[PDB]
Structures are given as structure tokens and as C-alpha cells.
């Protein structure tokens, strides 16, 4: 119900879902578009107990997709509760 009147859909993809699993758990993504290719990374980190905890980790990539559209803004979606 998030969208309405889906029209001339030019790309789709379905696979195993992204978000796997006391401590608030932190998950690391990078969203980046290069010459039409939309690159998606991933990483998961358990974090004890706001602030970003001073530490170091690395992010693996997941998949890249050639959406090939012009992007200038982004709006992160979230649930009510």
C-alpha cells in the first residue's frame, strides 16, 4: 500500500531478504550509483547498548544493479511502530 498506480515498471528483483539478526544491533549499508549501476553493500554488527560506538569494522558488498536513472534525493522509509 506504500505506492499507488504502478506504471511502466522497468526493473525488478526478488531474493532472500536483506535484514538478518538485549543489545541494539547496528547494520551497515552503502548506497551508491555509478554510471547507471546501483551498488549495495552490507554488514552486521552487535553494539552494546545515543552515539556511534568508537571502534572499527569493514563493510562487504552484496550486489550491483543497473537501474540507470538520474538520482538527486533519497527518502528512508520506516514503520509507524
Amino acid at each position: 500500500r506504500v505506492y499507488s498506480s504502478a506504471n511502466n515498471c522497468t526493473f525488478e528483483y526478488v531474493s532472500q531478504p536483506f535484514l538478518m539478526d538485549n543489545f541494539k544491533n547496528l547494520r551497515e549499508f552503502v548506497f551508491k550509483n555509478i554510471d547507471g549501476y546501483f551498488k549495495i553493500y552490507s554488514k552486521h554488527t552487535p553494539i552494546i547498548v545515543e552515539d556511534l560506538p568508537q571502534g572499527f569494522s569493514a563493510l562487504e558488498p552484496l550486489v550491483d544493479l543497473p537501474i540507470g536513472i538520474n538520482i538527486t534525493r533519497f527518502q528512508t522509509l520506516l514503520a509507524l511502530h
Binding site: 554510471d35 547507471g36 543497473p66 540507470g68 536513472i69 538520474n70
Partner: peptide, 27 residues
């Protein structure tokens, strides 16, 4: 006339960018 093309636009396109205009008279 099922094929059309563009020759007027504000700026040039991006690599691998599909911007969605006049038609060719293919005879």
C-alpha cells in the same frame, strides 16, 4: 513513426542514462 528521437534538451545525458521528442521519417 513508431520510433522517435530527441535533439533539444537542457543538458547532455549521463552515461547509461535513459531519459523518457521528434520522429524519423524512415522511407
Amino acid at each position: 513513426y513508431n520510433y522517435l528521437y530527441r535533439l533539444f534538451r537542457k543538458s547532455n545525458l549521463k552515461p547509461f542514462e535513459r531519459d523518457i521528442l521528434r520522429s524519423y521519417s524512415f522511407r
